[PDB]
Amino acid sequence: MFREESRSVPVEEGEVYDVTIQDIARQGDGIARIEGFVIFVPGTKVGDEVRIKVERVLPKFAFASVVE
């Protein structure tokens, strides 16, 4: 981009959100796509509504786990 990225992202490392697993990648990774940003929550189900702890975030995708 010609414009610098402000890095204004939805999620940061160490956060928790009440998300619904809308999609799943073939392996068991729940895809929480917030505005298009793909957060992987391994070990979930389609339609599963859980509090995910976003452990860490990468420039292309985020990792989170279910803390019930």
- How far apart (Å, rounded) are the C-alpha atoms in residues 52 and 4? 30
CA distances 9 to 6, 37, 41, 48, 62, Å, are: 9, 9, 18, 23, 11
DSSP state of 4: P
Q: Please name the amino acid found at residue 58.
A: L
Query: What is the span of the domain harbouring residue 28?
Result: 1-68
* CATH number of the domain enclosing 51: 2.40.50.140
> In the chain, what are the helix, strand and coil shares in percent, each to the nearest 5?
0, 50, 50
**Structural domain count, the chain:** 1
